Design a protein around this ligand. Structure first.
Ligand SMILES: [Zn+2]
Lengths: 102, 84, 131, 97, 157, 114, 60
RNA sequence: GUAAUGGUGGGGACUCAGAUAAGACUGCCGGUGAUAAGUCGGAGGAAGGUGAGGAUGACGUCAAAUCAUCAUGGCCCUUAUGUCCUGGGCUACACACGUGCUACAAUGGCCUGUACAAAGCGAAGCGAAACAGUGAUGUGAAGCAAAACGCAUAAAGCAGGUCUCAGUCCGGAUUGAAGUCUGAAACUCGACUUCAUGAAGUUGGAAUCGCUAGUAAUCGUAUAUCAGAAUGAUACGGUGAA
């Protein structure tokens, strides 16, 4: 299969900056000249909350909200120490977060 | 209906009060709050006044009271047998 | 990678999805690695499923394989019906008019509603009892 | 059916309770055989009384009456009289043939 | 008020035993609880039992005729003019004919006394075939009740 | 037309169900009685001979407590709680629910008819 | 809410069965939400204003 | 790989997941309509006349609800109406009304074998394989911050045996005995299991409620609050009409 892979999961609330960080990372690694497996989209996680509207009796009337989490995945072939160091060194706009496994 | 592996429940303060009464020949009344304490067979033949939230209701404990709880014999709300 | 399956299609229903594979043969049907008759136990639903073939007078000369999941028994029957229709279309343009005449190309976008707050169900409401 | 007298933030003198009953026997000669329920809610909210009478008819009609007053006896007199008159009006609605 | 309802489904002409819509409609009227398979099995077994109680090969024929022996012609619909309610006769439509028939057989069979499922319904079906029983009684009752009140037939609006 | 423990069973009834007519016997323990005296539960309570029913009565008053004694110490248990003046005892005394049910709207299967 | 009740909820009980969660913004003892640690009314107000990231209106 | 598992090596074909786009706008055709606006059918098309559902609720009304979520004018208490704890109580009854669940039974009850889902949840939390146990559950720890594993072999259904219109193998309330789990504690005042106990109830008067299609109807599943405890509430799918 492969000697080892770097599994990096991108978590965000916002699709735009999540995507932006995704191409930022893919460009950053192709600069380092490594073969890459495609940014693969994981299912979005939706948590729906239903709350009352009035601060008192009125029960038939309510309101619904979501929290939406968007997830992407990157796989890195043939891990390199310099490649991992650069990945950890990369700075990142707020709202998109990274999880790394060797 | 506790598990067997837990054994009966008796509060510790009530339990060493029971031991002190057991080592005393005087059969003094014990006033208590822990209605949830099980009647352990050792403490048969005592007199305990349990608090039902208003007053201390007394009981003489016989052998057959064993296995119950203290609150079982101190009524907490009174009905006058008529709803008027 | 023989690609013996000459054509392939997909079909959907309430919440079920089926993948259909046309092969050369005597018309045998294989569903989820099980016999078609043993899988779809209701002969009604089996006739339901085989209706596109009887209409396109092609049963008995093409073998079928089906990989179907989701939905209930009726949903899966409808899904495989739709898959057969789409596979026949992918095979031949000649069957297009008759299949569309029977409505086998337009699939039942009809799906279950969602429950709404203040309602016991999608449309049922709580009892009023005004008196 | 027999009438349901409810009260909020107030205490029923037996005088006023049987006053209400004495005003309500007007129904059980003419109207009782035509109604499902007759509720009378008394409230005492702004140093005044608020009365809500309510009647349901056997043919799907619903009568409601809301009033305010200062003295319970006077308020009950006016409200019950209005209720009885509106009930008579609806009965005649239907029986006009 | 906004009439001309959307076109009915009508696509269920049961492709299981007879390619006939009327059997499908009868099974649908039979349904309790949302159990189409149970209804289909009961109806198939019961009509088979009827066809061998009368010993004919063609079951469609006997089933259809036992229906048509109950399908009514003129029914009573109530209107009211000038504070006077009149039970005017009016000619039913064909769809309502099958509906009233099937409803009457189903009600009589369900409320009858019997041992079992297809037992009750086959028994009622042959009673209808022979033009006797609760269903036929109800049909003729509606017929000649409408006929006993034919004076108001000029109120067909 | 066998009689066990004073109760003679309806001959028309499937015997695994017929024994349930004996107080202290329910469906499950009727099943143990059948498979423990080695009589097919499907055999009717009419075609039963005498030696095997002697076997059943052996089983019954060997392993189980039946209407007489069962009534005896259920009444004994009730009176034991009732004379000792416990909550449950005085509850039995009054005629009100024991396990802590509502006693304002839905307690008249014990309270009786309204 | 009652500030003393807020502080007692914050403090350590004799055991966890003695302590109940409260909206520590307003101290409402109930209507609580664990994901946000605050009551339904505080949640509605602040999510409506957009002060709770990630929480928007739900069309179903 | 003998299993059970795409399980293993493999493979982008498909489903699928999620980003970016196309697509349905009376666009086109016929009839009618004041040359109109509109309107009834037809073609194409997954979708046709707002496709279906949700979100979105004008000026104002009812001195409508909330000082008890918060904020707040005035008034009021200041070893008190404040505050720490123990226990009781919010679970009290001759009664009346409203909301639901389970039934009254044959489109069914019970026994055995077998088949098909979706949406969700897991960090003091999920907790598997197995074994003990009729059972509630117990010992154990694999795997997992999880479209990776676990909750979780969904139930109606189907294939057989049995019941025979019987207050019944229908109904499971009520009580007795012995257990399970939670936590320091569950007697008043928890849930669940095993065994017995087997009541009312024969489709319910006047009157009244919900619903136009995946809708009623019914069958299960999941979540929120939560140490523990839902027939309520929120959400999901199965069968599926008139
Ligand atoms: Zn708050």
């Amino acid at each position: 299969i492969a000697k080892d892979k770097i599994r990096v999961r991108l978590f965000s609330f916002d699709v735009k900056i999540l995507d932006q960080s995704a191409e930022s990372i893919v460009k950053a690694v192709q600069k380092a000249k490594a073969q890459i497996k495609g940014p693969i989209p994981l299912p979005t996680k939706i948590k729906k909350y239903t709350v009352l509207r009035s601060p008192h009796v009125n029960k038939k009337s309510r309101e619904q909200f979501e929290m939406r989490t968007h997830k992407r995945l990157i796989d890195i072939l043939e891990p390199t120490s310099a490649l991992m160091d650069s990945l950890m060194k990369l700075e990142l706009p707020a709202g998109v977060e990274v999880d790394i496994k060797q | 209906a506790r598990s067997i592996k837990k054994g009966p429940f008796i509060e510790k303060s009530l339990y060493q009060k029971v031991l002190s009464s057991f080592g005393s020949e005087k059969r003094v009344v014990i006033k208590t709050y822990s209605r949830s304490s099980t009647i352990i067979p050792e403490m048969v033949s005592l007199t305990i006044s349990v608090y039902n939230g208003k007053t201390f209701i007394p009981i003489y404990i016989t052998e057959d009271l064993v296995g119950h709880k203290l609150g079982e014999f101190s009524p907490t709300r009174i009905f006058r047998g008529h709803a008027k | 990678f023989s690609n013996v399956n000459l054509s392939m299609g997909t079909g959907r229903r309430k919440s079920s999805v089926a993948r259909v594979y046309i092969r050369e043969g005597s018309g045998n049907i294989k569903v989820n690695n099980r016999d078609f008759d043993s899988y779809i136990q209701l002969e009604n639903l089996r006739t339901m499923a085989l209706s596109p073939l009887v209409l396109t007078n092609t049963l008995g000369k093409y073998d079928l394989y089906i990989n179907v999941y989701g939905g209930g028994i009726s949903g899966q029957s409808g899904a495989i019906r739709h898959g057969i229709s789409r596979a026949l279309f992918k095979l031949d343009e000649s069957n297009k008019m008759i299949l569309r005449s029977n409505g086998f190309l337009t699939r039942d976008s009809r799906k279950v509603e969602r429950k709404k707050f203040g309602q016991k169900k999608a449309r049922k409401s709580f009892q009023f009892s005004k008196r | 059916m027999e009438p349901k007298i409810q009260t909020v933030n107030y205490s029923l003198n037996e005088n006023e309770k049987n006053f209400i009953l004495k005003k309500l026997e007007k129904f059980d000669t003419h109207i009782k055989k035509h109604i499902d329920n007759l509720k009378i809610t008394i409230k005492k909210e702004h140093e005044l009384f608020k009365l809500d009478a309510h009647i349901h008819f056997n043919w799907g009609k619903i009568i409601h009456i809301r009033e305010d007053g200062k003295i319970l006896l006077n308020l009950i007199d006016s409200a019950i009289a209005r209720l009885y008159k509106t009930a008579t009006k609806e009965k005649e609605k239907k029986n006009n043939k | 008020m906004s009439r001309k309802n959307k076109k009915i489904k009508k696509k269920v002409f049961v492709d299981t035993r007879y390619n006939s819509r009327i059997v499908a409609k009868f099974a649908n009227r039979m349904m309790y609880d949302g159990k189409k398979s149970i209804s289909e099995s009961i109806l198939y077994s019961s009509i088979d039992l009827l066809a061998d109680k009368l010993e004919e090969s063609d079951k469609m024929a006997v089933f259809y005729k036992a229906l048509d022996n109950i399908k009514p012609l003129v029914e009573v619909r109530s209107r009211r003019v000038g504070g006077a309610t009149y039970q005017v006769p009016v000619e039913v439509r064909e769809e309502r004919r099958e509906a009233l028939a099937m409803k009457w057989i189903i009600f009589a069979a369900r409320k009858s006394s019997g041992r079992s499922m297809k037992e009750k319904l086959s028994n009622e079906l042959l009673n209808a075939y022979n033009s006797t029983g609760a269903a036929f009684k109800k049909k003729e009752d509606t017929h000649r009740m409408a006929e006993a009140n034919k004076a108001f037939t000029h109120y067909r609006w | 037309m066998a009689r066990i423990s004073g109760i003679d069973l309806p001959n028309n009834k499937q015997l695994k169900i017929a024994l349930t007519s004996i107080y202290g016997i329910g469906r499950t323990r009727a099943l143990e009685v059948c498979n423990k005296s080695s009589i097919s539960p499907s055999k009717i309570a009419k075609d039963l001979d005498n030696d095997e029913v002697n076997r059943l009565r052996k089983v019954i008053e060997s392993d189980y407590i039946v209407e007489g004694k069962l009534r005896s110490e259920v009444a004994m248990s009730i009176k034991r709680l009732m004379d000792i003046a416990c909550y449950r005892g005085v509850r039995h005394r009054k005629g009100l629910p024991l396990r802590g049910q509502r006693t304002k709207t839905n307690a008249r299967t014990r309270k009786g008819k309204r | 809410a009652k500030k003393s009740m807020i502080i007692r909820a914050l403090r350590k009980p004799k055991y966890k069965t003695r302590q109940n969660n409260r909206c520590k913004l307003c101290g409402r003892p109930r209507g609580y939400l664990r994901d946000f640690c605050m009551c339904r009314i505080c949640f509605r107000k602040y999510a409506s204003e957009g002060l709770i990231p990630g929480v928007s209106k739900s069309s179903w």
